Design a binder for these strands. Structure first.
Ligand SMILES: *[PH](O)(O)OCCCOc1cccc2c(OCCCOP(=O)(O)OCCCOc3cccc4c(O)cccc34)cccc12
Ligand SMILES: *[PH](O)(O)OCCCOc1cccc2c(OCCCOP(=O)(O)OCCCOc3cccc4c(O)cccc34)cccc12
Ligand SMILES: *C[C@@](*)(O)[C@H](CCCNC(N)=[NH2+])NC(=O)[C@@H]1CCCN1C(=O)[C@H](N)Cc1ccccc1
Ligand SMILES: *[C@@H]1O[C@H](CO)[C@@H](O[C@@H]2O[C@H](CO)[C@@H](O)[C@H](O)[C@H]2NC(C)=O)[C@H](O)[C@H]1NC(C)=O
Ligand SMILES: [K+]
Ligand SMILES: [K+]
Ligand code: NA
Lengths: 250, 27
DNA sequence: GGTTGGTGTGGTTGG
DNA sequence: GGTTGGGGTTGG
């Protein structure tokens, strides 16, 4: 997170750290959507151009964390993975279309002050919140520029499609949106490498609940003027999420 | 069913330092 | 079709 | 120091 600030405690209790076993390492962000299901970016798990390919037993998740490298005695809970479900139409070759994966944990996580799932949007929520100029919030432990000691947060406005399009040569699809301040706006901020998989969330002014509208997917550099962060469009992939969970069990 | 209401925030009727910026960005 | 679109027999992948 | 920096979001 570039040009963000330290999170307050229990500000983002659905935040999840994808943690590599050996060598021991932070890989990516993720989010908790129920007691046995975590949502992440597919490219965190599978990206052949970099020779990346992680299986269930290569990884752990850490939930309830604030500090980046300290084990938080009595706060955080660590879980093993039972199964990874990468979207079947993920496209790592071209433009990271459908950059999304679900992970089922081996055991249910007990909720607390510091561990709690985010809501996923429906049609109406999507239609009223995902609009240009509306701001959402991005969180993570990724790079502070083009490494922090506590979780970083930044608020960024959704950008209209034609501006997103004109900002990159990468082929944009309807499974993505972009966010960030325009050069002339003055305020600044972006996600960066290491933040992938983390949620773009918005608080509904109707029922005051936080909804995950996006997943940190890609960008070109970090916080460059006239460039914007790209996010997987969570509602557009909601039918797939409900299908996987309904079939494989909560 | 309990989703998206934070134990330290919404459940306590306390806000975080920056959510107001989000709310104001709507209409 | 599918846990999945269609340029529908491979492709960034089996059958 | 510890699974871990400098009470705390938690023992000793
Ligand atoms: P594994 O080794 O078991 O897989 C091989 C055997 C199963 O093969 C298939 C089963 C079902 C479908 C297909 C297939 O479908 C392609 C998409 C649809 O294409 P289309 O719109 O052109 O429809 C096909 C038109 C011709 O239909 C048939 C062709 C040959 C045989 C039969 C048949 O026996 C019954 C009905 C129709 C057809 C592509 C490849 C394999 C399989
Ligand atoms: P449980 O109840 O079985 O055991 C808990 C009792 C032991 O508690 C501690 C053990 C080790 C370290 C510390 C501690 O470390 C803080 C590091 C910073 O040092 P400082 O700046 O606080 O140094 C001040 C020195 C004060 O020394 C003492 C104070 C009181 C008692 C004693 C004593 O009995 C022997 C030697 C020194 C001191 C902080 C707190 C507890 C423990
Ligand atoms: C895996 C994630 O941590 C990371 C997030 C980057 C966020 N950037 C900004 N400024 N919001 N994503 C990446 O690193 C992705 C995955 C692989 C390469 N990549 C990129 O963003 C490239 N920099 C650009 C790109 C290459 C291939 C396909 C799409 C985009
Ligand atoms: C990523 O790694 C996994 C684990 O090695 C690969 O899964 C294996 O390879 C083939 C094809 O998927 C299958 O026989 C088995 O599922 C696994 N076999 C072994 C040897 O464990 C998978 O192929 C890799 N993914 C990609 C896209 O290359
Ligand atoms: K196919
Ligand atoms: K301590
Ligand atoms: Na920018």
């Amino acid at each position: 997170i570039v040009e963000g600030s330290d999170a307050e405690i229990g500000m983002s209790p659905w935040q999840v750290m994808l943690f590599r076993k050996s060598p021991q390492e932070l890989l990516c962000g993720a989010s908790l959507i129920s007691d046995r299901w975590v949502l992440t970016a597919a490219h965190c798990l599978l990206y052949p151009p970099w020779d990346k390919n992680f299986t269930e037993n290569d990884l752990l998740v850490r939930i309830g964390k604030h500090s980046r490298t300290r084990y938080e005695r009595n706060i955080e809970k660590i879980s093993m993975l039972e199964k990874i479900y990468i979207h079947p139409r993920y496209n790592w070759r071209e433009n990271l279309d459908r950059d999304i994966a679900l992970m089922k944990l081996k055991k249910p996580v007990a909720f607390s002050d510091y561990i709690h799932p985010v809501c996923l949007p429906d049609r109406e929520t999507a239609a009223s919140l995902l609009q240009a100029g509306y701001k959402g919030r991005v969180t993570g432990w990724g790079n502070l520029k083009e490494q922090p000691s506590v979780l970083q947060v930044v608020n960024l406005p959704i950008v209209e499609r034609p501006v997103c399009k004109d900002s990159t040569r990468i082929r944009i699809t309807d499974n993505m949106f972009c966010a960030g301040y325009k050069p002339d706006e003055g305020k600044r901020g972006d996600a960066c490498e290491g933040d992938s998989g983390g949620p773009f969330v918005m608080k509904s002014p109707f029922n005051n609940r936080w909804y995950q509208m996006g997943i940190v997917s890609w960008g070109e550099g970090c916080d460059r003027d006239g460039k914007y962060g790209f996010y997987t469009h969570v509602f557009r992939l909601k039918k797939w999420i409900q299908k996987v969970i309904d079939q494989f069990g909560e | 069913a309990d989703c998206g209401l934070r134990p330290l925030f919404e459940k306590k009727s306390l806000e975080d330092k920056t959510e107001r910026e989000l709310l104001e960005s709507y209409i």
